């Protein structure tokens, strides 16, 4: 019954964070925060509730008692997007709280736009995977349809998008669309229509089959 | 510095037994101020702490783990390991093995200050797929990149010109396609100039089907 909240947030580069953690009880050993930055393992930063871990920068903070702690980021910094976990241990157990998501709002920012034709070696094997990149961009959200012909397409295409940029704190996206070699011969114009907020009106990408 | 390694299998079948291990190195794990536990971490969930283990050979466990979960230690290779018996999807995690480090006099005080990077493990009765590698041929600045198609399971790496190339390199998530198999794409942006100059190879490892590719990425 260990609590975190907020569950997640959106700030601003230099803004004041703070997140808070609730132990399950009255805790008699150390109450640590771990840093875990997307695709890696967590990182000690605070432990037993206020002690920096040597190397730790300044800016990160704990506080609080009995059962009531709080993490502290006084001024964000883009390569703070992380999840922060607080971690009790009692009753012989070690607990982890359900984790704190941080991430950066920005400026909009307008995504450079590619697109790539299916190799040679792929169209040997039966198979038609046409890519669309979005390159930088911020809000994370993004509109991607696909045209064939001019034909709007539907069912056969799946997007994944980057975790936020450490730097810039941008997103990109790529967006597949697969078909049969047969089909994929059956047409010459395939194009990537981008929809965004950055962007005034949508940008169209596209190449002719052979 | 005090370093930790896991290492084991990434496919382990239903109602079998997961087994890992992990490799200390940088400091002895005779140490009398730690202790070497097991966390695991189930794909977009939190943290569940396994269980630890002495170096003389005491254990303890999550009780909703203690029924299925051997916590073990070998001195001598300096490895401690975790044996996890029938497992279900349920077990299906990122393993990461940590230090824990203890101190008081009248309390025993504990945090876990080193971790490993992470075993993926995944229970399946599929078999392990290594994955088909293709270019994304570029048509001042541009894109090119590598698609990496059909695999199973997580995960595969990808590296450019064998890690010399690094800035502006996008590795996406990876995409449960509609045939149960994993797809990725890797990205970077380069200058335009460099195009059929300069030679761009993606390296892709795939540790569950022992794959191994070089693709190198040509213009047009
Ligand atoms: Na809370």
């Known amino acids: 019954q260990m609590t975190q909240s907020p569950s997640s947030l959106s700030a601003s580069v230099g803004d004041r964070v703070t997140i808070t953690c609730q132990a399950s009880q009255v805790i008699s050993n150390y109450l640590n925060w771990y840093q875990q930055k997307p695709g890696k393992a967590p990182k000690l930063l605070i432990y037993?509730?206020?002690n920096l871990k040597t190397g730790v920068p300044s800016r990160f903070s704990g506080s609080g008692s009995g059962t009531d702690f709080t993490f502290t980021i006084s001024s964000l910094q883009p390569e703070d997007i992380a999840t922060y976990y607080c971690?009790?241990?009692?009753?012989?157990?070690?607990?982890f709280g359900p984790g704190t998501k941080v991430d950066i709002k920005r400026t909009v920012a307008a995504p450079s736009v590619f697109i790539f034709p299916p190799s040679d070696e792929q169209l040997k094997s039966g198979t038609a995977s046409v890519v669309c990149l979005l390159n930088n961009f911020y809000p994370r959200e993004a509109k991607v349809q696909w045209k064939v012909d001019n034909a709007l397409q539907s069912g056969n295409s799946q997007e994944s998008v980057t975790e936020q940029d450490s730097k810039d704190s941008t997103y990109s996206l790529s967006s597949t669309l697969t078909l049969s070699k047969a089909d994929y011969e059956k047409h010459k114009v395939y194009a990537c229509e981008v929809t965004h907020q950055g962007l005034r009106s949508p940008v169209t990408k596209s190449f002719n089959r052979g | 510095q005090l370093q930790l390694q896991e290492s084991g299998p990434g496919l382990v079948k239903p109602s079998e037994t997961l087994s890992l291990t992990c490799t200390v190195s940088?400091?002895?794990?005779?140490?009398?101020?730690?202790?070497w536990g097991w966390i695991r971490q189930p794909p977009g969930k939190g943290l569940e702490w396994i269980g630890s283990?002495?170096?003389?050979?005491?254990?303890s466990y999550n009780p909703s783990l203690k029924s299925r979960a051997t916590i073990s230690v070998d001195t001598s290779k300096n490895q401690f390991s975790l044996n996890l018996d029938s497992v279900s999807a349920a077990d299906t995690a990122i393993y990461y093995c940590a230090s824990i480090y203890g101190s008081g006099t009248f309390y025993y005080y504990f945090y876990m200050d080193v971790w490993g990077k992470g075993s993926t493990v995944t229970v399946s009765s599929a078999s392990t797929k290594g994955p088909s590698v293709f270019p994304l041929a570029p048509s001042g600045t541009a894109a090119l990149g590598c698609l990496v198609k059909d695999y199973f399971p997580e995960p595969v790496t990808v590296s450019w010109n064998s890690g010399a190339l690094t800035s502006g390199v996008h590795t996406f998530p990876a995409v449960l396609q509609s045939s149960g198999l994993y797809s990725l794409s890797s990205v970077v942006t380069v200058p335009s100039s460099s195009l059929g100059t300069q030679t761009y190879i993606c390296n892709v490892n795939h540790k569950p089907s022992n794959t191994k590719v070089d693709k190198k990425v040509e213009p047009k």
């Open positions: 037993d509730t206020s």
């Open positions: 940088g400091g002895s794990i005779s140490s009398s101020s730690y202790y």
């Open positions: 283990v002495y170096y003389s050979g005491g254990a």
């Open positions: 971690q009790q241990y009692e009753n012989l157990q070690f607990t």
